[PDB]
Amino acid sequence: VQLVESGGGLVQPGGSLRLSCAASGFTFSDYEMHWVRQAPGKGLEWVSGISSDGSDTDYADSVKGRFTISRDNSKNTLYLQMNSLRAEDTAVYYCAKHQVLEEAYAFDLWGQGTLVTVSSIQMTQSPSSLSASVGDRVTITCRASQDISNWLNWYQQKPGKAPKLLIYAASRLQSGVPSRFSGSGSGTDFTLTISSLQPEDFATYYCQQSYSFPWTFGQGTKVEIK
């Protein structure tokens, strides 16, 4: 089971690119699919989404009228037509599957991302970065600009790696993530806690509200070494 993005590259301002996202191991046609991007000044930014049958589409305001999302459910392929590209569109672009997990919605499958370079409800996380050692207890906080009940997910993004779903619905651990990771909170203040930091836990962590559209992420919390 994986998603594989292709089509990135270097493009002049005002240029065009077409990204494709090839899905495998699951019934692609059954799932809402989305593009999410991260610019060199990071933080995840939802770009666009499309319903399972391809009839309903959505875009972030910053890409309206320039990007077009589509899908070929017969070839398990998602597309993003990017016209009139701008310097600010420089980013890694992720393809992601939206899943109803228990009674909640999360992006539970992501691709590794493709790089686009152009040249010739608010979520607040704290801290923005922290340095720690192996064995340390790490506390990361997310505050929501509104009550969102337990409609909150946490993602882990290792350096140079695709983001990964850690916790959904504020406290529910995703399959495979170890017990040291734990989430708590409801309403407007949420906590991700790593009970004992391991070397593979050095990463950037993102919260994301799943309560009202458009989906918004926190700016990220960088967990650095030393």
Add this chain to the structure above:
Amino acid sequence: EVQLVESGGGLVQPGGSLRLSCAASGFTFSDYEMHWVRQAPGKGLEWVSGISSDGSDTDYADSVKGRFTISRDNSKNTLYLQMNSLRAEDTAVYYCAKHQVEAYAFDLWGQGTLVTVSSIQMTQSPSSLSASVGDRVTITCRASQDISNWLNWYQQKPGKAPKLLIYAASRLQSVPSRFSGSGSGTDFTLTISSLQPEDFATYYCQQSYSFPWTFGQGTKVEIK
């Protein structure tokens, strides 16, 4: 005239692509599982990708799934690695290696090709050490799990193909008597009884017990 030769490296901006090739000669390439293994200054050795003998089954490390594609042309005795959407973290020397079986080890490597872009854990100690000719050198490896004697040691000189020294914790490859391996379970030690001048090199341990195959960060043996 048994050898592997990698080509296709170079310098690339982030997000670019390269295609590495590994040319095999002197053995029946089509019969063997083939692998790519890479080395950055920080990580030691890191297994990247493997492909079954017939080219139909492939495997990738988590750090490169979906960006790298391994394939083989068994009619031209050639392994390939297509690297798309390259990252700074992919900067490494890339080796192609043949997997060999009693025990499982990487018994043949190429000299490597350099790419610049601009879960059982093994811990080795020391990371570097200075010694003289005639010295006894003791290198230690610890596994995050019991792995009985499923543990190999490699030697790597600058710019030369890595070399299999000891497999199954204590068994010498067809390698001088001064080299000696011991340990089982979770603690292993590599011993050079009397350092020779051609013995100044970087050494790596590797567990052959559970997939994915993992290496220690390496022990650099320097002069002084």
